[PDB]
Structures are given as structure tokens and as C-alpha cells.
Symmetry: D2
Subunit: 317 residues, 4 copies
């Protein structure tokens, strides 16, 4: 039988070594037939309380576990609100081709038609499947396998809230039957240049929400609070309001890296559209979203704040 470790970052979504994982095995007994399961409790929080502190603890533990010859994969149970950020962080920091699968539930385990039992069962099948190797970190939700780079929560409440709006799911898992149709051609995991092994605190990056009649005071507060980066979630193709642009140009010149994303929800924030990124000293985040752009920029800042090197990071990953 494959050996798999479930890492819990909160409560149950439905002795292994963590009571929470013990309860998962009670709630979804069919998973004990598929893999030998060990449990750890990494954190015990809603995903909306997540911190760089917990990300770095999680990423270092996943790297430890996947260096062990007996461990074939890791599953992480995680609140849905920020699963896309943790997943994306791990996609660039996990130095392995062994599967890492992130799974949660849009309804609590006690609700009518709770989604968490099917999700967990499907997650374990994805984690043990031979094809899941070198697919990078994935989110498994609602019978779908989404690449960490592309995946996002699109909906506030729906069981089908996870989507890959720029590329679509790479695979399906239906009552445990795992099929891949595509794979990411952007480098992840073992091919990643990032290494957080001796990082104990991630660079501060704020995200600003653009609109008509915008301000500079939020740009200015981010600077005063020690922002090493700012993601601008711009209007349409990453366009800022003029007062804000002026503040962001000053930000960039003081050596705080400014990366242009968009508020819209999908598509690329492109270079050489209406914003002279080279002249203003900005980075175009291209086909990401503000919250994943933030993760990539934090990782960039562990080893450079050069506009050109960071543009190349956003155009590569």
C-alpha cells in the first residue's frame, strides 16, 4: 500500500498521529483501503487567518516528508478561502516531483450533502495515482484536478467555486478514477529557482484595489508600513487611476517593486499596453491574479528587487 501523510491546517473537512486525521479516517473509512495514512496538525485555523509564518512551516515540513523514501505523497486539508495562495506558494517552494494535493470543503462536515467526504476520497486517489508525479502541486475539488498556478476560488458559496479561468482543469477524478488531459508547461516544484529552507519571514507585499476617483494614501501607507512590494489590482488590463500611478512611480523609484495585476478575474495583464512599465519602473504580472501575483512577488523578493529579473520571473513561472 502507498504511504501518504495528511497535514491538517484546521478542523475536519469531513493513531495516525493527529486526532483531526483520526476523525477524517472515521468519517471516510474507504480511504484506509487505498493508502497507509499518517496525520500531522501543522496549524489549527480558518484559511482566512493564514500567515507567511504558517506557509514557511508547512513548506519546510512537506519538503522533509517528501525527502523520506517511504512517503509517496502529501495531502493538505485547508480552508477554501486562501487554498489558492498556499497551493501556489508550495508549487514554487516544494523541491519534489511526488504529488502534493490540497483539498477542502465549501460546506461544513455536519451540513446536508457535505462535499468534504467525496473531496477527501478523490484527493487520496489523486495523491497515490502514478500520473500525478511531476504535475506539480494541485487542488482537488468537486471531481476536478486544477494546477496550483491556474486555480482560483471564483465563487463565494458554490461547491463548484474552484476554477482555472485562464486554462481549465488539467484532470478529473470521478469516484476515485483519475484522468489527466493536460499539464502545465510553466516550471514548478523541482524545476523552481526558489528555496525557502533558510527563510524565516517572507517580504511584505500589499495589494491595492483600483477604481474611479482613486487615491495615493493607500500606496503611501503601504510604503510607511515597510512594503518591499505592491501588487496593483488595476482596472481592465491593469490600468491605474492617475493620482495612484504617480504614487506608484515614486514607490518604484524608492526601491519598492510595483507589479501590475487586474481586478477583473481573468486574462493577462500584458506588457506594452497603455502603461510604459520600463519608463515608470513597473513589472507586468501577465496571466496570474492579484493574490497569486503577491505570492510570486514575495518569493522574487527573497533574492532580488531588480525590475528586469522580476519581470523575467513573472514571464517564466
Amino acid at each position: 500500500k502507498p504511504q501518504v501523510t495528511i497535514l491538517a491546517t484546521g478542523g475536519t473537512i469531513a493513531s495516525a498521529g493527529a486526532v483531526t486525521v483520526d476523525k477524517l479516517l472515521a468519517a471516510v473509512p474507504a480511504i484506509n483501503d487505498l493508502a497507509t495514512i499518517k496525520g500531522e496538525q501543522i496549524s489549527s485555523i480558518g484559511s482566512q487567518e493564514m500567515t507567511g509564518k504558517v506557509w514557511l512551516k508547512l513548506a519546510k515540513r512537506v519538503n522533509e516528508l517528501l525527502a523520506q523514501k517511504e512517503t509517496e505523497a502529501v495531502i493538505i486539508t485547508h480552508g477554501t478561502d486562501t487554498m489558492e495562495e498556499t497551493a501556489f506558494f508550495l508549487n514554487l517552494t516544494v523541491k519534489s516531483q511526488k504529488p502534493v494535493v490540497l483539498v477542502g470543503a465549501m460546506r461544513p462536515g455536519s451540513s446536508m450533502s457535505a462535499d468534504g467526504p467525496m473531496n477527501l476520497y478523490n484527493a487520496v486517489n489523486v495523491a497515490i495515482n502514478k500520473a500525478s508525479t511531476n504535475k506539480g502541486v494541485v487542488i482537488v475539488m468537486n471531481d476536478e484536478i486544477h494546477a496550483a498556478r491556474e486555480a482560483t476560488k471564483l465563487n463565494t458559496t458554490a461547491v463548484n467555486a474552484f476554477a482555472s479561468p485562464n486554462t481549465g482543469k488539467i484532470g478529473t477524478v470521478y469516484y476515485g478514477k483519475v484522468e489527466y488531459f493536460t499539464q502545465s508547461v510553466r516550471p514548478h516544484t523541482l524545476a523552481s529557482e526558489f528555496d525557502i529552507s533558510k527563510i524565516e519571514e517572507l517580504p511584505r507585499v500589499d495589494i491595492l484595489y483600483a477604481h474611479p476617483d482613486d487615491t495615493d494614501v493607500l500606496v503611501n501607507a503601504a510604503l510607511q508600513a515597510g512594503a518591499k512590494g505592491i501588487i496593483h489590482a488595476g482596472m481592465g488590463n491593469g490600468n491605474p487611476f492617475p493620482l495612484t500611478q504617480n504614487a506608484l512611480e515614486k514607490a518604484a523609484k524608492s526601491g519598492v517593486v510595483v507589479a501590475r495585476s487586474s481586478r477583473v478575474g481573468s486574462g493577462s495583464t500584458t506588457q506594452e499596453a497603455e502603461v510604459d512599465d520600463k519608463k515608470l519602473g513597473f513589472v507586468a504580472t501577465e496571466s496570474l491574479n492579484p493574490q497569486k501575483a503577491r505570492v510570486l512577488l514575495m518569493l522574487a523578493l527573497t533574492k532580488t528587487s531588480d525590475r528586469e529579473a522580476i519581470q523575467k520571473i513573472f514571464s517564466t513561472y
Copy 2:
């Protein structure tokens, strides 16, 4: 022939006296529209929509109200940048005191480009403007052969000609080479049915939007407050959930008489009452089924006549 005014907020959305050089160039570009209606033209502003302000919204709304109050004028078409068309559309949808059609239209590609989308978008927008079924549909955005309710429309994509969507409801109808069909209509009050009146307003109240993430801060809430925010939209994580440090700052905002409304960063779905956030104890409003940029517009209008949490919840549970 039906009498229609085209109000330009910016450059030409097609090509490259009706009373404005921008509209004379639209008519030269898409001569078919001259056969559909007697077009008059005015330049309201001279800006890309990323430069839009409350000042321009107020000028634009008052002018639309004056034009539709004229017996002879049957509709207004507004040519607008795509980036913030959804905000302008939602603003007029709650301030325009008339059932006559108001149609916003723009171009995802410049007029000069290969396969410019502006000519079809404008030609279609004219047909929607003059169609009898467009009466009391509220303000609409006509883009890519689709008619979207102002309440529900958003730019969902950075570059695509199909970048406009109604994620919570779908388009209310279609317009294909001029042929106009409606399949649905909004049951949320708009236009004539709206309680809001900006005829006597010269400056709209300040409302900030904050983007939520893990490891969030209180220093943008405190900066919003210090710049005299009357309202704050919180673009929360998932179902409008804040980071703990941030909720603490917003609680202090809400007690100090600044209205905090919870929306979401995700893209779609309702930011609901009676979920993980205790709005009644913390002093917050839930925006429910809008998005942070349109929730900003509704809170600005709410703040023109009340800062009361209960009244403002009722506004967001109505419009």
C-alpha cells in the same frame, strides 16, 4: 425616425454636424446608423475610463436626466472606456429618473486595429436604444452581440472582445446584426423605481476598497479613515471573510461612524448575511450579490442620505 443622443466620454470607439466631432466621426465610420435614427452628439468628458471621477458621473447623470425629460428624445447611447463602464452603468441605473433606454457601449480593440469590435458594438447599441422592448429594462451595456443588465454586468477579462459577463445572472438578451431579442429582465428596482436623487449633489461621498489576503494589515483601513472615508468596501477572502488584524481595524472604523460593507475578491456569488462574520455585533453590512466596484457605487449613493447600518443593509438587500 427616432431621435437619439450619443454622449461621448472619450475618443472614437469606431473608425480611423450632429453637434460633436467625436460623434460626426462615429457616423462617418458606421454610416448604417444614420438610417436607424436622427443622431445628435455631445462630448461629456475627454478621458479613458481608468481616469473616471465622481465629478464626471454627476455631470453625465444630470445630462441624461435632462435629455430623457425632453418629449422629442427617445434614448441616450453613451460611448465609454471598457475598464470602468460597469461602474458608470450601475451609477446611471440608480440615478436616471426615466424608463427610456440608456445604452453604454465601447470597444475592447482600438478602431485602427485589425478586426475592430467598435463598429458592430455601436451599430448594435443603436438598435437596442430604439427597440420598443428596451423600455423599462434599466440601463444596459451592449457588447459582443449581448445585452447585459447594469446591475449584473462586469468586465471579467483583460483583453478579450467577449470580456463582459453577468456572472450571477447571464445577459438579459442578444443583438445580432441589429436584430434585438430579450429573454429575461431584472426584478431588482432600477431607474424610475430608485429612491436615489443626485440632482442636488455636487460631490459624492468618499468610499475606499481594500483587497484582502493572508497576513493582512490594519494600515490601509487607518489610511482610508485619515483621508475621510465615509465608507469602506472590504473585498474579503471567499465569502467576504477578513484577516483578524483587519477585522479589528474595520470594527474601529464602524464604531467611529464609517460604514464597512463586506464584498469579496473571488468574482461571483453573494457575500451573505449570517455566514462566518457577525455583521450585527461588529457593525458591518453584507453587500450580497454584487462585486466590490459596484458595491462601492451603491454605498456612495446610500451615504448621500444615511450612514445607518440597518438602512444600508436594506439598500443592499433591495437594489
Copy 3:
């Protein structure tokens, strides 16, 4: 408390005397619905929805008409297999002579499955049935926290719990843990406004559906004619286009007096008039904004009182 009848067409969609053992088993598995309504139950048929027939359709619409004409009855819920729920819903949408709510609900996973969707679907569906705002919304499908107008609804996916969609218009409403909110209503006539009356109809006119592709054939048109087709829905390539050989057979079918209606295989959008097919000259109808299976239901009802091409086109341009 509201009085609602659940009509079961098959087995239980939830779990593993109201009047029908199937509905008693629903009430046992989902006891929270019993504080919402006084439930009566009847068994109309005992089949998977892939075994549905015109005979069951007529039995169902007649019984719903009787039930909703009772002063004691506020609404009807029909538990239905998912495969053909859209056809039954659309039939009832044009045959039910009431504004009282009619809700179709099913389950994409069986009741005995992990994370069964039936219990929530059914709970949500009762809340929609008893909601005041559901009056005169027409027959609706309630699946995966969504209210879909019968005209617009389709199963779009083989297996997903979110398989139901309204691809031309979107959901008319949400239901979330029983909280019902409508955002739109269909502007196409339904239920009490429909010209159709099946009360005296014991068998529906025969309508066949054909799947278009390159290197297509005339033999299936010919077999449909040979079996006594009164109408044929052509699921065309792109905007309802036939292969030349097929179009020649359809021309003959139409001249013999069999009604030929052009639909499309693609999934969404209008099969339009005045496109590449000369419908007038060849004697064809364009089905416009439907899909082949719903076009079939509307043609079947159209044939209960005309086979006139111009009359039927008006029917497809109306409903």
C-alpha cells in the same frame, strides 16, 4: 403552513403516511422539510428519466393541473431523473395553467453515495416552492443552489453536481441553505399565458431529432418519414446548417407536409432566420434560442393544432 404535493416519477433522490412510500422515504432522510410545509405525496411513474415517454408527460401535466386548481395546494415539486428533467420541465412550462410554483429537482449522485447532492437539492426545492416570489416565475429547475427557468435550463455535463446551466441567459435565482432570492424573470410567455392545452390530448405528435455531421446521409430523414414523423428537429452544424444530401431530403419532407425545424448541435446561441438557409423557399422553421431536445417538445405541442410553417415560426419566435 403551506400545503405542497411532491410527485415522484422514480425512486428516492435522498437517503438510502404522506400518500406515496417514495415521499415518506424523502421525509425520513430530510426531516427539516416537515417544519416548512404540510407534504402530500403521489407516485406518477416508476422510471429512470431516460425511459420517459409522451404518455408519462401527459399524465404528469394533467395531474399537476388538477392539483394546482385545488384551493388547498400552494405548490407542486416533481422528483425527476436528471437526463431528461429539462424536457419534462419545458413541456410543463407550456401546459400548466397556474402561476403557483412548479419545481423540478433531482440528484447527480445517488442518495447512498458519499456527499449525496439529493438532500440539499430537495430542501432547497421545498423552500423555492413555498416562497411568495416564486409565483408566476414559470416551471423551474432547482439544482446546486440555482433556480433555472424551464425555457433556458439544460444538463450541460455528464456527471458534475453543477451539470445544470442556462447557457443563453443564466440562473433566474439562488437558493442557499433555504434562502430564496430571484434576480431575473423570463420575458417569454409561459404557464397561464401559454396558448397550449393538452387536457384532451392522449398521444403527442411524433417528432424525430437528427444529428448533423460532414458526409451526412438522407436515409435517417427517410426512416423518420417512413415511421410517420409529423415533425423533424435537425441538429445542424454551426448556425443550423445541413449537408447538401440531407437538405434535399428535408426539402421533400417539408413539401410532403412534415414540419422541419432547424436547431443546432453546438450547445448555445440562436439558430437564426435569414442566415445561410433559405427557410421560406425550402419550407423550414428556425428554432432560434433553444436546443434540439426542447425544440422537439415545442414542435410536438405546435403540431397538436397546426402544421403551418408561418404559424409554427411565430410559435418558435414567441415561447
Copy 4:
């Protein structure tokens, strides 16, 4: 410069000696493409794609194989009607023996139309064809700034310029004013990795497609057998489910040696094995994650070298 041959299967998709007047017109309508590549032209056929036949598919795939085997030729672009582009694209995906880019492109609006999509579509296709990362992506469809895998691609709308989608996976990349980006690639074997070889084929096996509904028939299955069908695609209700009368006729079809492949009318998702239909007992094949019309293309290619149910199941579970 790179050398690219444009193959025309119909009229100009843009405007209103490379070696073909159609391609000469394309180059004059979009002179931008002369800077990007040395373009040669051929007229393979002159038809609307709704008139495509296996004879044209074989002529086209054989000429693509000749052109890409030349050391001077870097890529092939094929202008094609949108209606059946997914079928031809898919056929070439399994029959082209090269890793060199093959790109299909068309237009949802005629070249003479306001906001014609053809010029940009063609310009973007030439950029995808000459891009280094286009190597070994399989045959692609370039439409509306998107690069779709031939395996995954379909026309989803009758009219919209954004009609092309990959509902099971999404686009594998973007092309925006010529700038090419891939984000994924198919992990299903294609082009040079495919086991199919049509170099010694003259006529593709006959495969029909049947459209499933309530009160379904056996007279179309029976007509398909009488016309010498070697394969039948069944476009089933939900997860590929037949009406009983039709199932009994398909079981007889299968026992006769006619390969029955189960697909779905719904639009997306897998028609799975070991759901409600005993495939192994009934003697049927599950087409899994395709659609009726691409499953037809795979079954026609399967039928060039086996009619064994087990071997064809493996082909559908592989390609």
C-alpha cells in the same frame, strides 16, 4: 524568414503569386503577415465546411503530410469554415505524422462584415505557426486570441466570435496581437505519436450519429445498418444513456459487428464506463471525454484497422 503554406478549403476568411488566388487575396487583406513568413498558397477544396466529406479529409491530411515532410516547410495553416473545423482539426490531430505546427483558422463573420474577425484570426494563426513553442503541441485551432488543442476544441455557440471553447480542459495558450504564450499542453498522444496511418486509405468507414430523447425509436439504428454503417455514435441522454427501444436495436447492431460507441448530447464531461449501461455485456464502447462528432472521427479511424470492441475501448481510453 520561416516558410509557411496556407491551404484554403473554401473562400477568403479576410477582406472582400503565392500559388493560389484565395491566398493572394488573404495576403492583400492582411499585408502584416508578409513580414512574418514566406507564405505559399494552395486551394485544397472550395466548399462551406458544412459540405465537407471524408474524401476532402484524406486529400487534405495526405497533402499536409507531403508539405511537412519537406525540409523547406516550417508550418501549415488551413483556412476552414467554423461549422466542422473541430472535426477536420481532430482528424489531422491523429493522421499528421510531424511535430511541425498545423494551425486551423476561420471566421464567425464574413470578411465584408463590420468588425470582421477574419483578419486578426489569420494574423494570430501565422504567429502561432512560426512560434518555436508551437512544436509538438499537436494540431491547434486559433480563434479569438486563443489556442485550443484539436482533441479538446469545439464550436459551442451558433453566432458568437468567441464560439470556440475547450469545455473539458480550456485553451492551451493565448495569442494577443501576435504574441504567443502556451500555459498547458495535451498529455493524450497526437500527430507523430498516433498509431493511425491514412496514406493507404481511399474511403473512411461509414459512421452515423443518433440523437437520444424520451420516446426514442429503433428506425434510425435500423436505417443506419441498412445503409452499411460500420460504426454508430449514440449521442446519449446525460451520461450516455439510451431509451430502451433504442438500446435493444443498438445491442442487435453490436452483435452484427457494427461498433456502437456511447457519447452524450449534453455538451461536456466524460461518457464513462461502469455507470448505468453494461458496456461489456451489451457489446458497446464508452467514448469517455470527447463529443459525438469527434468520437465519430476517432471511431472512423479505429474502423480502418479493427472492429474489436476491446481494441476500440483502448483507443477511446488512450486518444
